[PDB]
Design a protein around this nucleic acid. Structure first.
Ligand SMILES: O=C1Nc2ccc(Cl)cc2[C@@](C#CC2CC2)(C(F)(F)F)O1
Ligand SMILES: [Mg+2]
Lengths: 406, 543
RNA sequence: UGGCGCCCGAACAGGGACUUGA
């Protein structure tokens, strides 16, 4: 095959990201699989000629024992953003988000059959670290399309369509969408039939040599709305907490009012004093209740703007997240109560949130993780199971935004 | 027979063309002698007319030293694969170890044929020379030599997996578990193997024996330690001396246990001139005396044993100082250290302990590639309450409780619901942005209002002051309603210490309280008594 | 002369809380 010329973003140089330290177990795994990759010709050892480097991690996908290489191409993806979005971007179908079942295959093994542009292999370089820096880390390139690089599916989509066209013709009701390395196969058939079609698709890929959470239910996803506390007797603290929550919610819902509620707190009263809601106050509170359940009016997805996902730790294994582009314009607010370990729960929440956005908007969000930068960077690879990696930043959660749910 | 590493300049740049500085009689005579010797050895070739490039050449017997500033910033960027160095704790016990100083290390690796012309020379009376080998001080010489040396050692390390070879800037550490007689024979094989590629290493007679002074460490075949650290016994201390003292005992902290640098490091704040005689504080003097006592006896580390599991016992030194002893066997510790750093203005023991654990985990992965089994001085229940009721995703790996006198615990806890029968205190404070004549006060449901003028206080300081008034004038149980997220955020974190003295006074007042509820109400919304407080604390400050 | 580590200070950008004025 002829390599597709890949041009880096003008005015930007290849990645030079430092390799994060890896445990001896991961380093041993990486050397075992990278030596095999070099033997097969997928990678080649390089000298100090090129200064580029992308951190490489080792993970274990769900329900798997063999180790899996996870190369962090987040910086390379940014440095080549034009190539894989406008030149060869993959359109996102708006149908799979409404499908009963959306299976997530792993077609990233078919990219290694496509050679990579020689002038671009320099930027796709990674170093395998050594414990205690005893020996120099092993430096490798990619003689074939790297998987986890957003440009490989764009280059391979020409071959992927030919692979899936015979399948899609016979199954027009299946919405197949690949983001980076997976293949989100959505269908409205029952669970029994849908798995059969996935097996048919899997057998479809094997005939071309493409060896193959795992299954999602987009139709069963509902945004968790803001719910105000309900009680027979209201204390001064309860009204104060309610007014503070409603006052903050006014930034999201313009129709929220706290006028009559504040009229109950006129003088200086004990926080435990029981305040009997007046008729006007009760009516206004009811008005706020029905506004909150309604969706945020005027909020629409803007493809140009990057999605931002904010996660809050509600405690007891419950996490609340909100996906937005502009502040207070939440495109989707949810909760990850599935959950032991805070980092394990946060990593699972990040992967679940990212997968939800991929099948809804076709793009991972920017994550505002409520975790220390060093704690996450050290333990996030022990629970990661997704081939893709989103962009995250670490923030200090304000105490009064954690009250998305009491 | 060494394969050259292709090199090229940065895009749009060309080889430097610098003027040669007229050398003196004693420099020119020596330089030509060096150039003639290297030329006869093939390390330099004469390219006068076809190489319109030049670099500054000077002598600093005489040793040639060319400054490659112009060429260093024009050559392609290299990847320094090994930037850090191995901590001796990460090494492993070896029965026999030898150090081979690679004579003419860089000068044995040929330079790229297309790049030699850019490293041109010029010596007055001139004569032009170019480097046929890796130059000294060049940007690519370290990376290229390490790559070239690594490829030279791979066919020998593969044949001798038992032998462990570590390569540094110039010296080559070849450790082995073989006997002295057998080890020397194997080292000769490496010396002959290296000689096949032209690399020269010293013989046994000209070799060095342990200890091996390496990057400040004094490495033995079975134990390691930092090089002898002697602290000055002077009377008057300057910022330069404190910087030397802090650095010297920071090096010792990784082996010597219980090294405190908190007080001495604080003396470096607010001082710029290095000649300013710092009046060493009693606390700083006390720490310095303790550090001197710790360094009285020699402390030797131990090498990593992969067959055993790492332990990491952490101790609390007080005042935000932590000490950890990473070990595998009892009382024989591979490495020690400290975590005196404070993340943020406000912290407590539990949050600091988690940060200290994370720091140990990060340094343990780089050194040993595995996290240790921590032995923290914090109760399991105490940690459970913290991380369960904390907004971060804090987590620490498998750890065990060790009962030491300085246990880690939460000095106070804020009630999750209003306290029945406790007088409510609505607290707020307004600070002028020009005259800084702020004001703080509180209003309670029992008609007990108070105000105290403040000076040189900020908006933030006044809010904390208003909280402090409520705790002072309340009983054991107090309900505090503050309309500021700054004060709420600080107190809700349950800090035990902080740089600010205003918050510290609050902490010592929160502990005395058996029950404290800190509520929050939006400002300017007329939320009951909070509106009244703003009237008192803004009568002559805000408008 | 370059690199790394620690500390101090300054300028930058963003991510927040808050005050005053228009
Ligand atoms: O594995 C080991 N064990 C060891 C034991 C004692 C000494 Cl002094 C040195 C080592 C060694 C090393 C090294 C570099 C710091 C100098 C060696 F490579 F073997 F030389 O690493
Ligand atoms: Mg105010």
């Amino acid at each position: 095959i002829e390599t597709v010329p890949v041009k880096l973003k003008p005015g930007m140089d290849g990645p030079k990201v430092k390799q994060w330290p890896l445990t001896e177990e991961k380093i041993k795994a990486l050397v075992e699989i990278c030596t095999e990759m070099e033997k097969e010709g997928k990678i080649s050892k390089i000298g100090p000629e090129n200064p580029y480097n992308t951190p490489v991690f080792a993970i274990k996908k769900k329900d798997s024992t063999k180790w899996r290489k996870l190369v962090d191409f987040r910086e390379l993806n940014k440095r080549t953003q034009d190539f894989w979005e406008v030149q060869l971007g993959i359109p996102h179908p708006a149908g799979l988000k409404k499908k009963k079942s959306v299976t997530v295959l792993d077609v990233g093994d078919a990219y290694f059959s496509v050679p990579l542009d020689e002038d671009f292999r320099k930027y796709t370089a990674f170093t395998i670290p050594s414990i205690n820096n005893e020996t120099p880390g092993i430096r490798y390139q990619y003689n074939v399309l790297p998987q986890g690089w957003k440009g490989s599916p764009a280059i391979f989509q020409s071959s992927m369509t030919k692979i899936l066209e015979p399948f899609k013709k016979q199954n027009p009701d299946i919405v197949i969408y690949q983001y980076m390395d997976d293949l989100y196969v959505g269908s409205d058939l029952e669970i029994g039939q849908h798995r059969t079609k996935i097996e048919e698709l899997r057998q479809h890929l094997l005939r071309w040599g493409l060896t193959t959470g795992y299954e999602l239910h987009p139709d069963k996803w509902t945004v968790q709305p803001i719910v105000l506390p309900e009680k027979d007797s209201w204390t001064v603290n309860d009204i104060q907490k309610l007014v503070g929550k409603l006052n903050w919610a006014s930034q999201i819902y313009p129709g929220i009012k706290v006028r009559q509620l504040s009229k109950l707190l006129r003088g200086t009263k004990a926080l435990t004093e029981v305040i009997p809601l007046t008729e006007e106050a009760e009516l206004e509170l009811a008005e706020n209740r029905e506004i909150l359940k309604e969706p945020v009016h005027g909020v629409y997805y803007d493809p140009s703007k990057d999605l931002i996902a904010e996660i809050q730790k509600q405690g007891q294994g419950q996490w609340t997240y909100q996906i937005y582009q502009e502040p207070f314009k939440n495109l989707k607010t949810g909760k990850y109560a599935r959950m032991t370990n805070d980092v394990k729960q946060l990593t699972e929440a990040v992967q679940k949130i990212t997968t939800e956005s991929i099948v809804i908007w076709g793009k991972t969000p920017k994550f505002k993780l409520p975790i220390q930068k060093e704690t996450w960077e050290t333990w996030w690879t022990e629970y990661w199971q997704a081939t893709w990696i989103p962009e995250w930043e670490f923030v200090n959660t304000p105490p009064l935004v954690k009250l998305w749910y009491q | 027979p060494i394969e050259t590493v292709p090199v090229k300049l940065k895009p749009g740049m060309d080889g430097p063309k610098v003027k040669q500085w007229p050398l003196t009689e004693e420099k020119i005579k020596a330089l030509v002698e060096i150039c003639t010797e290297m030329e006869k050895e093939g390390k330099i070739s004469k390219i006068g007319p076809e190489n319109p490039y030049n670099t500054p050449v000077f002598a600093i017997k005489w040793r040639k030293l060319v400054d490659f500033r112009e060429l260093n910033k024009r050559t392609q960027d290299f990847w320094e694969v090994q930037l850090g160095i191995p901590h001796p704790a990460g090494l492993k016990k070896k029965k026999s170890v030898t150090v081979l100083d690679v004579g003419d290390a860089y000068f044995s690796v040929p330079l790229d044929e297309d790049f030699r012309k850019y490293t041109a020379f010029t010596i007055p009376s001139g004569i032009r020379y170019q480097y046929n080998v890796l130059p000294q001080g060049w940007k690519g010489s370290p990376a290229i030599f390490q790559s070239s040396m690594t490829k030279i050692l791979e066919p020998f390390k593969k044949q001798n997996p038992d032998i462990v070879i570590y390569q540094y800037m110039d010296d080559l550490y070849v450790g082995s578990d073989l006997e002295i007689g057998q080890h020397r024979t194997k080292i000769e094989e490496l010396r002959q193997h290296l000689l096949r590629w032209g690399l020269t290493t010293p013989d046994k007679k000209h070799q060095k024996e342990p200890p091996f002074l390496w990057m400040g460490y004094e490495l033995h075949p079975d134990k390691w330690t930092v090089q002898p650290i002697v602290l000055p016994e002077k009377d008057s201390w300057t910022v330069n001396d404190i910087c030397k003292l802090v650095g010297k005992l920071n090096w010792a902290s990784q082996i010597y246990p219980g090294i405190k640098v908190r007080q001495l490091s604080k003396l470096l704040r607010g001082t710029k001139a290095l000649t300013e005689v710092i009046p060493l504080t009693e606390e700083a003097e006390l720490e310095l005396a303790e550090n001197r006592e710790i360094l009285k006896e020699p402390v030797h580390g131990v090498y990593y044993d992969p067959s055993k599991d790492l332990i990491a016992e952490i101790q609390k030194q007080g005042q935000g100082q932590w000490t950890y002893q990473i070990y595998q066997e009892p009382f024989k510790n591979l490495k020690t250290g400290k975590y005196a750093r404070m993340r943020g203005a406000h912290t407590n023991d539990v949050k600091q302990l988690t940060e200290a654990v994370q720091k140990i985990t990060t340094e343990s992965i780089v050194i040993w590639g595995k996290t240790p089994k921590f032995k923290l001085p914090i109760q399991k229940e105490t940690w459970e309450t913290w991380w369960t009721e904390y907004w971060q995703a804090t987590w620490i790996p498998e750890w065990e409780f060790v009962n030491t006198p300085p246990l880690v615990k939460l000095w106070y806890q804020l009630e999750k619901e209003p306290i029945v029968g406790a007088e409510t205190f609505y607290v707020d404070g307004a600070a002028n942005r020009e005259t800084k004549l702020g004001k703080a006060g509180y209003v309670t449901n029992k008609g007990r209002q108070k105000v105290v003028p403040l000076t040189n206080t900020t908006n933030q300081k006044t809010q904390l002051q208003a909280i402090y008034l409520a705790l002072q004038d309340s009983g054991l149980e107090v309900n505090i309603v503050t309309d500021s997220q700054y004060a709420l955020g600080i107190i809700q974190a349950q800090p035990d210490k902080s740089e600010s003295e205003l918050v510290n006074q609050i902490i010592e007042q929160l502990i005395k309280k058996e029950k404290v509820y800190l509520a929050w109400v939006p400002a300017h919304k007329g939320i009951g008594g909070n509106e009244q407080v703003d009237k008192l604390v803004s009568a002559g400050i805000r408008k």
